[PDB]
Amino acid sequence: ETMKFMAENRLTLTKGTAKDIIERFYTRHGIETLGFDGMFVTQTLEQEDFDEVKILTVWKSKQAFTDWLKSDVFKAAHKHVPIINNKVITYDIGYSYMK
Amino acid sequence: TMKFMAENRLTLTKGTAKDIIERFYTGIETLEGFDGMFVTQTLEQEDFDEVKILTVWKSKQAFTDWLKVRSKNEDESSPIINNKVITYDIGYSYMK
């Protein structure tokens, strides 16, 4: 039913700018109003040369994600948000256990 | 809750993710600092397969205490090319 598909926006940033970028995601622009199950914004630890922030979104299906890519909430979040690189990766969640 | 993430990233020879993956779907939820885990498979991967066992914790402490699948460079028959562990601070999270 839910938590079957995960999407990741991987951001490679100038070292030191990670906090400011992350705070930018406290305003999610209504993504929760969607097949959306949750999101995580992380910072890779022990990085010396670059900062890496990953925006992980969990959905109930790939289509939930692809439809989101086409939504107005996607546009507002993409326009709201240092970033040297920006890559998108997707995954099939084959197993999840939320306690 | 959910403020730390540990990732066990497994690079596999293209096509072997299918079987191997089910062995990670497996009493870690008994720890207080443990919040949850995800096991994923990367889509659209061209030359190799990728399995990531993600676990979320309340603190880096929980994960550390907890801690304290061989590679080819060991058993030539293993599908696992590389086995890395990455750690993260969860700056923000929202569920449901």
Where exactly are the structural domains of chain B? 1-96
The fold adopted by the segment(s) A1-99 is Alpha-Beta Plaits (3.30.70)
Nearest to B48 by CA among B14, B78, B81: B14
The 8-class DSSP code of residue B32 comes to T
Q: Which two tokens stand for residue A63?
A: 């289509």
Nearest to residue B69, comparing CAs of B7, B3, B24?
A: B24
Among the partner-chain residues A19, A93, A99, the one whose CB lies closest to the CB of B38 is A93
Binding-site sequence positions of B for heme? 23-28
Contact B96 A25 (CB under 8 A): no
Query: Tokens in use for A18?
Result: 């990670």
Structure tokens at A98: 């939320």
**Chain A residues within 8 Å of chain B (Cβ atoms):** 3, 6, 18-19, 22-23, 25-26, 28, 32, 37-46, 53-54, 58, 89-99
Distances from the Cα of A99 to the Cαs of A92, B9, B56, in angstroms?
A: 20, 22, 10
C-alpha B31: how far from chain center: 17
- The top-level CATH class assigned to B1-96 is alpha beta
Backbone angles phi, psi at A21, to 5 degrees: -70, -45
SS3 A11: strand
Token couple for A39:
């999101």
Question: What region does B29 belong to: left with phi over 0, alpha with psi -120 to 50, or beta?
Answer: alpha
Cα separation of A65 and A45, whole Å?
27
**Which structure tokens are listed for A47?**
């990085």
Count of CB atoms situated within 10 Å of the CB of A39: 20
Tell me if B56 sits within 8 A of B90, measured CB to CB: yes
Breaks (C-N over 2.5 A) in chain B follow: 26, 68
